[PDB]
Amino acid sequence: GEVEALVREAAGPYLESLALFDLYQGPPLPEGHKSLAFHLRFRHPKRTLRDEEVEEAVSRVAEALRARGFGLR
Amino acid sequence: MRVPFSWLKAYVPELESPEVLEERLAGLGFETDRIERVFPIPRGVVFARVLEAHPIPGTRLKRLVLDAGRTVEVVSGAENARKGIGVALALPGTELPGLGQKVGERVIQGVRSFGMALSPRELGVGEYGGGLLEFPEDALPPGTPLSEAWPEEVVLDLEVTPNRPDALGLLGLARDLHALGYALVEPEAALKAEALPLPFALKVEDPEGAPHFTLGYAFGLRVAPSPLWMQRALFAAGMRPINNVVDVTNYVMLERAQPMHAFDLRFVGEGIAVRRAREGERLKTLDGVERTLHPEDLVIAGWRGEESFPLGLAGVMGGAESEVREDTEAIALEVACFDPVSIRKTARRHGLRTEASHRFERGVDPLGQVPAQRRALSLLQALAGARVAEALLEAGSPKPPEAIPFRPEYANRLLGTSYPEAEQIAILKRLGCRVEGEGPTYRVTPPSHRLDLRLEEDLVEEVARIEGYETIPLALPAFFPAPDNRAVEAPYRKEQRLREVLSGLGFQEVYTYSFMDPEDARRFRLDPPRLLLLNPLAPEKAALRTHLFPGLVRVLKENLDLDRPERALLFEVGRVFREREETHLAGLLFGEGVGLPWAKERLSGYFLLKGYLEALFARLGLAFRVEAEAFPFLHPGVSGRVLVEGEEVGFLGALHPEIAQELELPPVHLFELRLPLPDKPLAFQDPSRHPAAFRDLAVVVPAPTPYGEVEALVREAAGPYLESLALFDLYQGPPLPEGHKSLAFHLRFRHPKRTLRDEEVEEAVSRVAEALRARGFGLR
Amino acid sequence: HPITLMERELVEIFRALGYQAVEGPEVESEFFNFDALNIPEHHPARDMWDTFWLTGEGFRLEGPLGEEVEGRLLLRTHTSPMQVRYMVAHTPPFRIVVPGRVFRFEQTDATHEAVFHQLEGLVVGEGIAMAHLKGAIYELAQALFGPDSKVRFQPVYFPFVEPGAQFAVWWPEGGKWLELGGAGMVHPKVFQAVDAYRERLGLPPAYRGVTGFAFGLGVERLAMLRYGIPDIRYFFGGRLKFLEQFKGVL
Amino acid sequence: LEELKALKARYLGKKGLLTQEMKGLSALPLEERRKRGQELNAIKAALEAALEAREKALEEAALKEALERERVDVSLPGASLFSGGLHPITLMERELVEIFRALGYQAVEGPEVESEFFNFDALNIPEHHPARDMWDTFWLTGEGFRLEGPLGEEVEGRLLLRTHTSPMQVRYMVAHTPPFRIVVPGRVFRFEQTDATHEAVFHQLEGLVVGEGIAMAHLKGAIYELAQALFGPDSKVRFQPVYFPFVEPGAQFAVWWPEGGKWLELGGAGMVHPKVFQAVDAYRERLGLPPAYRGVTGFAFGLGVERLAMLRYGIPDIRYFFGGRLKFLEQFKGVL
RNA sequence: GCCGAGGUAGCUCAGUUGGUAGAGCAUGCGACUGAAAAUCGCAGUGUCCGCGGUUCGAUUCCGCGCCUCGGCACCA
Ligand SMILES: Nc1ncnc2c1ncn2[C@@H]1O[C@H](COP(=O)(O)OC[C@@H](N)Cc2ccccc2)[C@@H](O)[C@H]1O
Ligand SMILES: Nc1ncnc2c1ncn2[C@@H]1O[C@H](COP(=O)(O)OC[C@@H](N)Cc2ccccc2)[C@@H](O)[C@H]1O
Ligand SMILES: [Mg+2]
């Protein structure tokens, strides 16, 4: 709950969907940890968007994901 | 229809304002699409008098010397620019709407042009721009501002329904505003006729097309431009002035919705002959258009000796040749009532739509001709100083309208109103009816022009409107419906519930055009449509759908292309066509499936759908099972029919791979039943309170056999005391023969009154093993 | 579908006034769509509807009494033909509303379609007045826009209702008059065409001593204004992103 | 395999292109005879042969695996999604409500825990009331419980479980103003030993139509309509005098059941009593609302749902509804 | 049934001193993962409306008829 709440939040307005296509608590990950893989989706009303915009967002999501205390495989 | 406020206000003097008029015409039965101010003419435009028009050598231009108070010159390339006419002179420093940049002194081909003489487009009074306006040379004192004699006008745009052709004439429209209590002013055509013979003869040869045909005779004509009030009026109504004569014809037409046309006698020959065009005959109408004539066209012809030539496309548009011009002195005035159908046909046959045909199609006063002839003849005498003859030339004797039995008692019964008899009779009489009655049921005979009044219900309408629909009170009827109306809405509540139920489980409803692409007939392997179209919006939408899935599927492709739905469960209820119209229900599953957003383990495909579907009829309490059947549009591997309550009604499977491949689509599943679904009456049945003896038992069966036949057999011989059944597992493995599989059923027996002994169940569990052998199945 | 959410509500609204909900066929005969409704050939007034003509041999169109009805096949240009059908089938008094998809030939735009839905309302019976017609709309109005709503009737023409009318409902929460549909007292010749058809089928006349009102409204337009859908071409569009929006309108 | 056989489009493209559009293109058009045609040829001779061949090749390679592989026993049980259902009491109630809805009635509900004021007093059933014995009142006890009256105000009095839905008559009238038509379904509780046609907890259906000009003829018309809708045109109603302290001209009614040739006794009815109108308006003053039921008259009726249901769905014993048996319930999955 | 404009890759679409039939997410194998993603080459499902022409891959001259639009004439 807290994870998504945060991702969607800072994910930006242009964020259409979200989704959780898998939860992994395995080997290549620290002790007592788990990874949540989200399938995001952005979209603009009037025109298409450039990946330079999405990054400036996909990033904003990674920054708060750090300021808080989460990683990003 | 364009309605120039002031033009109307001439017949209806006391009108409040363009606003109120729209409110008034509203309640009368005509709504205005728009209202607009029209002739903003700057102080810079004055009336001027063309003293002389001098052709600029070497050019195609002219140096005009105009009396614009003082004398000035102007250069103009307008053909119609000549000596002796008036013009709208835009002085240097004038802001024109039609050409926005400021007019000024400009030198052209050697002459200091002092401003310019405007044209219909340039002044903003009409779209025409191929000549200057042509005012009566003495119109106003040279130099006076034009507005001073051409005030801003307000035009309403009125919708005139087919039941009011009398309304395609402002004097007619006016007659309605009158009934509301507005003073009416009808023009009094003031003729000064002369008893003399007419230089031509009439010879109507198709009285069927020209039920009533009259010709007028005005001579010694002095053709010149119309006065400003005329030109101003015509323009506000969407028409462009052309002169004396021609203008009065158009004016009258608009006034009393009676098209007329002045033929120049030089061309009329001996007389006018109203006949049908001789299959072949050619005619060049006013629009400059040279046309051929279909032998069905009603023509206005002239004959000379033993000759006969066309002069105008009767009721539609006059001929180019005989139109009156400046050098004409005598005319033959056409004022007739033409067969509405003939005009309609012809008008369209030649793709023509005139103010003339439009009215003759909708309907002309069957007896308004002659009064019209005098109005025109009068006016011609006053503006063209014509010398109108005294006798007309009639052809046809229409019968005045018959009486209509009118009971103001019924009017009030049918309306739910209680208008006093008096108000009713009064109104009716204002609309021009003759109420020869004593009471209670009067003999109301309407005006020749009301074509929309034949019935007593027509009349009652006239009260409601003139009295105001807003005066009809609100009420609610109370009654017990006739018995054959009870439960008529079952069929409806049934299907509705259905949808509602589907929407329950998880289906998303979808509506899809009833149209079908003839190609999809092949593209999805279906039989071609039986009902096609004679006017498809597009060949793609050329036929009528014979199935609901072709569409359900297409809306899928279209989805996955605009957005990429990871999955989708859809349904549609619609009318299909084929031999008979029939309602169908269609479904569609597609995508990953149902499971856990994470854990890869998904639940889907064919059995997911059959999942919902079984769950579905489960809800409806209806028998459901599938039995493999070949369907040209489903994977042969996954395709069967659907059986509701035992009767077959559709199919369930996956779209044929070959197909998905063409529409470039992934795998997909669907079904399409036919409505209404079977109706099982419910029979309650107390369930026994005594424990259900239940036992398991596998059944080794050959791989090709369908679970359907197995169960059908087990349940059958399983005995009556059999409560449940169930299939808790299907095994095709090692400890079993070649090409075989075992079906393990979880049976359950139960007795109503008392418990049962295993000696009874065995005598049953056995009966199941015996037929399971007599047939050809094992029993692990 | 939004068309259904609306239809349902409209039907529930008239249901509460005692109306019955019955449907008719989409592929009609020129007899029920025009003739029995007083719209003869080359009819000047036969041009508000731009008829879709059909062609199909082996197709069995069937009239009210399940009999085979003849005539030039087509797609109904309004639901009004259900007025003629339901009357040869039942006897008065009765109140019916018949929803349905209708087809017209006109270029589409933001507030126009070639395939759309209407809603007929037919109340026949001795003693029925236009006051009753006005009461219905007044009720349709209230239920849809609350007590602060009001209706507006203005004369208009239809060959099948003599005292014809067009009506508008006052939309408070938007301060604007919306033009919903046509209406009026059933025309004398429709009653005549009905009973007349019945004889042909050996049924006694039944609409000789009665009167009655009909009304027909555009569903989509009401829906549009009601659900805020800006463009009318969305309903039949097919977009799941559009549809799903209405999951929950009750 | 063609995945590459496709990419070869540039493998053959650019590569072959390094022959024409890569060898002096500002002069190539001045060389057109043979060489250009060599490609004009190969460019066509290859694109069509190649690109399509590989396609149709797999178009018949992939589409082939499926056709053969994918073979299911269609008639095999599928996913086991659940299939809901509705209680019989609801199926009925709904139909009753839909029946009265069509007559212009409004469906509103009231509370199950009433006050002695709305259940008896305002209905004209004072203390030690001889006529207060058709209902065997369930008395309650609870401090901290906040029962609230019509105008959301705190209503006082001895708490209890309503012995009929009629108290919704008193509540709805202090809230709204006439004319109106209401039917208020609801679960009621009485103290009586249960049996085949009796419960301690059952459902009724009130019908209240107040308004100036309302007559018993209107009350009779309703039931006549309730009758038809439930048993077809061949149905008929029967009204016989009976007593209730809250309706003066009281009545009990029965509907004729054709498909069973028997008179069923449905409920009570009658014209609202003068003192109920008095108790209502009277209560309103207390709440500072102007009187509203001074110049009107009106009728009420109340029927037993279950009994109608029973006869309607064939359930022999009334104790089944609240029983809980899934084998019983599931039986009605489909009554529409 | 007239003037005039557009109709091209799961989609949004510019375009024209032409090597660009493509750009912007999006999409197809290796391989970084357990399973993905931000990635580096390697590539084009495209009849650039349909029937016929057009250069060495054509969209565009060019022909007529079709999906789209404004105005126009009607009047939903
Ligand atoms: N293309 C379109 N898209 C959406 N709504 C449309 C439509 N064409 C018409 N409508 C709606 O259909 C309504 C009625 O259709 P119309 O053709 O104007 O009258 C049709 C008559 N059949 C209605 C009527 C019945 C009984 C008595 C009087 C009148 C209109 O008020 C309008 O809101
Ligand atoms: N234990 C029980 N189980 C099932 N149905 C029961 C029942 N006790 C009563 N009923 C049903 O409840 C119906 C009415 O309840 P009863 O107590 O008789 O009258 C009760 C009043 N409140 C009804 C009424 C309202 C308005 C005007 C007049 C009368 C009966 O006709 C009966 O069919
Ligand atoms: Mg009329």
PDB file of C-alpha atoms in Angstrom, chain B residues 435-534:
ATOM      1  CA  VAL B 435     -67.946  30.478 -39.225  1.00  0.00           C
ATOM      2  CA  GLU B 436     -71.466  29.894 -40.495  1.00  0.00           C
ATOM      3  CA  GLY B 437     -72.772  28.250 -37.353  1.00  0.00           C
ATOM      4  CA  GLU B 438     -75.423  28.392 -34.646  1.00  0.00           C
ATOM      5  CA  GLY B 439     -73.926  25.967 -32.103  1.00  0.00           C
ATOM      6  CA  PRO B 440     -72.959  23.401 -30.835  1.00  0.00           C
ATOM      7  CA  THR B 441     -71.234  22.201 -34.014  1.00  0.00           C
ATOM      8  CA  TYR B 442     -70.388  24.997 -36.466  1.00  0.00           C
ATOM      9  CA  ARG B 443     -69.651  24.983 -40.168  1.00  0.00           C
ATOM     10  CA  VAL B 444     -66.131  26.411 -40.330  1.00  0.00           C
ATOM     11  CA  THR B 445     -64.801  26.956 -43.837  1.00  0.00           C
ATOM     12  CA  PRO B 446     -61.124  28.116 -43.940  1.00  0.00           C
ATOM     13  CA  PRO B 447     -59.287  30.582 -46.210  1.00  0.00           C
ATOM     14  CA  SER B 448     -58.269  29.376 -49.665  1.00  0.00           C
ATOM     15  CA  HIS B 449     -54.661  29.688 -48.522  1.00  0.00           C
ATOM     16  CA  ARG B 450     -54.720  27.446 -45.473  1.00  0.00           C
ATOM     17  CA  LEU B 451     -53.824  24.081 -47.001  1.00  0.00           C
ATOM     18  CA  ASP B 452     -53.163  22.733 -43.514  1.00  0.00           C
ATOM     19  CA  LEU B 453     -56.803  23.014 -42.429  1.00  0.00           C
ATOM     20  CA  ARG B 454     -59.078  20.179 -43.550  1.00  0.00           C
ATOM     21  CA  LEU B 455     -60.027  18.568 -40.259  1.00  0.00           C
ATOM     22  CA  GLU B 456     -61.779  19.580 -37.112  1.00  0.00           C
ATOM     23  CA  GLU B 457     -58.572  18.690 -35.315  1.00  0.00           C
ATOM     24  CA  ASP B 458     -56.716  21.162 -37.517  1.00  0.00           C
ATOM     25  CA  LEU B 459     -59.013  23.873 -36.308  1.00  0.00           C
ATOM     26  CA  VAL B 460     -58.670  22.934 -32.675  1.00  0.00           C
ATOM     27  CA  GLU B 461     -54.912  23.325 -33.192  1.00  0.00           C
ATOM     28  CA  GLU B 462     -55.517  26.902 -34.369  1.00  0.00           C
ATOM     29  CA  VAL B 463     -57.064  27.731 -31.013  1.00  0.00           C
ATOM     30  CA  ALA B 464     -54.352  26.178 -28.877  1.00  0.00           C
ATOM     31  CA  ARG B 465     -51.651  28.135 -30.725  1.00  0.00           C
ATOM     32  CA  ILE B 466     -53.437  31.465 -31.059  1.00  0.00           C
ATOM     33  CA  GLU B 467     -54.513  30.948 -27.472  1.00  0.00           C
ATOM     34  CA  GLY B 468     -51.070  29.766 -26.467  1.00  0.00           C
ATOM     35  CA  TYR B 469     -49.911  26.224 -25.720  1.00  0.00           C
ATOM     36  CA  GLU B 470     -48.794  27.812 -22.455  1.00  0.00           C
ATOM     37  CA  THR B 471     -52.480  28.161 -21.603  1.00  0.00           C
ATOM     38  CA  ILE B 472     -53.173  24.411 -21.845  1.00  0.00           C
ATOM     39  CA  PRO B 473     -53.069  23.218 -18.212  1.00  0.00           C
ATOM     40  CA  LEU B 474     -51.119  20.316 -16.737  1.00  0.00           C
ATOM     41  CA  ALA B 475     -52.867  17.120 -15.772  1.00  0.00           C
ATOM     42  CA  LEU B 476     -52.456  13.411 -15.220  1.00  0.00           C
ATOM     43  CA  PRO B 477     -54.814  10.720 -16.643  1.00  0.00           C
ATOM     44  CA  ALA B 478     -56.144   7.977 -14.390  1.00  0.00           C
ATOM     45  CA  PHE B 479     -57.517   4.666 -15.670  1.00  0.00           C
ATOM     46  CA  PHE B 480     -57.325   0.854 -15.501  1.00  0.00           C
ATOM     47  CA  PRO B 481     -55.663  -0.413 -18.691  1.00  0.00           C
ATOM     48  CA  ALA B 482     -57.573  -2.752 -20.958  1.00  0.00           C
ATOM     49  CA  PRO B 483     -56.763  -6.350 -20.057  1.00  0.00           C
ATOM     50  CA  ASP B 484     -54.754  -7.308 -23.137  1.00  0.00           C
ATOM     51  CA  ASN B 485     -52.153  -4.861 -21.877  1.00  0.00           C
ATOM     52  CA  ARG B 486     -51.308  -6.631 -18.634  1.00  0.00           C
ATOM     53  CA  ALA B 487     -47.699  -7.848 -18.483  1.00  0.00           C
ATOM     54  CA  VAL B 488     -46.934  -6.691 -22.023  1.00  0.00           C
ATOM     55  CA  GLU B 489     -43.587  -5.562 -20.614  1.00  0.00           C
ATOM     56  CA  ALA B 490     -42.298  -8.979 -19.598  1.00  0.00           C
ATOM     57  CA  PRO B 491     -40.192  -9.452 -22.730  1.00  0.00           C
ATOM     58  CA  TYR B 492     -38.534  -6.176 -21.783  1.00  0.00           C
ATOM     59  CA  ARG B 493     -37.886  -6.570 -18.086  1.00  0.00           C
ATOM     60  CA  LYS B 494     -36.520  -9.970 -19.067  1.00  0.00           C
ATOM     61  CA  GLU B 495     -33.744  -8.851 -21.393  1.00  0.00           C
ATOM     62  CA  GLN B 496     -32.981  -5.870 -19.199  1.00  0.00           C
ATOM     63  CA  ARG B 497     -32.490  -8.052 -16.137  1.00  0.00           C
ATOM     64  CA  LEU B 498     -30.231 -10.122 -18.397  1.00  0.00           C
ATOM     65  CA  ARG B 499     -27.897  -7.286 -19.262  1.00  0.00           C
ATOM     66  CA  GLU B 500     -27.926  -6.238 -15.626  1.00  0.00           C
ATOM     67  CA  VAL B 501     -26.962  -9.751 -14.607  1.00  0.00           C
ATOM     68  CA  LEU B 502     -24.105  -9.950 -17.127  1.00  0.00           C
ATOM     69  CA  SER B 503     -22.838  -6.568 -16.050  1.00  0.00           C
ATOM     70  CA  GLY B 504     -22.850  -8.284 -12.702  1.00  0.00           C
ATOM     71  CA  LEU B 505     -20.299 -11.038 -13.253  1.00  0.00           C
ATOM     72  CA  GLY B 506     -17.895  -8.762 -15.079  1.00  0.00           C
ATOM     73  CA  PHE B 507     -18.933  -8.176 -18.660  1.00  0.00           C
ATOM     74  CA  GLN B 508     -18.534  -4.731 -20.160  1.00  0.00           C
ATOM     75  CA  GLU B 509     -21.504  -3.818 -22.349  1.00  0.00           C
ATOM     76  CA  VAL B 510     -20.877  -2.657 -25.905  1.00  0.00           C
ATOM     77  CA  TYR B 511     -23.033  -1.149 -28.679  1.00  0.00           C
ATOM     78  CA  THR B 512     -22.030  -1.661 -32.321  1.00  0.00           C
ATOM     79  CA  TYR B 513     -23.410  -0.320 -35.612  1.00  0.00           C
ATOM     80  CA  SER B 514     -26.065  -2.582 -37.102  1.00  0.00           C
ATOM     81  CA  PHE B 515     -24.109  -2.197 -40.349  1.00  0.00           C
ATOM     82  CA  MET B 516     -21.858  -4.956 -41.721  1.00  0.00           C
ATOM     83  CA  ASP B 517     -18.995  -5.004 -44.235  1.00  0.00           C
ATOM     84  CA  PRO B 518     -19.941  -7.434 -47.041  1.00  0.00           C
ATOM     85  CA  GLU B 519     -16.293  -8.434 -47.037  1.00  0.00           C
ATOM     86  CA  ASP B 520     -16.397  -9.627 -43.418  1.00  0.00           C
ATOM     87  CA  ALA B 521     -18.745 -12.238 -44.849  1.00  0.00           C
ATOM     88  CA  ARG B 522     -15.635 -13.892 -46.188  1.00  0.00           C
ATOM     89  CA  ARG B 523     -13.201 -12.486 -43.646  1.00  0.00           C
ATOM     90  CA  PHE B 524     -14.935 -14.341 -40.796  1.00  0.00           C
ATOM     91  CA  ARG B 525     -16.411 -17.124 -42.906  1.00  0.00           C
ATOM     92  CA  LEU B 526     -20.123 -16.420 -42.643  1.00  0.00           C
ATOM     93  CA  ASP B 527     -22.942 -16.465 -45.160  1.00  0.00           C
ATOM     94  CA  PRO B 528     -23.440 -13.286 -47.151  1.00  0.00           C
ATOM     95  CA  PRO B 529     -26.138 -10.847 -45.920  1.00  0.00           C
ATOM     96  CA  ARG B 530     -29.705 -11.241 -47.203  1.00  0.00           C
ATOM     97  CA  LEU B 531     -30.569  -7.648 -46.442  1.00  0.00           C
ATOM     98  CA  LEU B 532     -28.266  -5.156 -48.096  1.00  0.00           C
ATOM     99  CA  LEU B 533     -28.541  -1.481 -48.678  1.00  0.00           C
ATOM    100  CA  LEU B 534     -29.485   0.663 -51.657  1.00  0.00           C
TER     101      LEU B 534
END
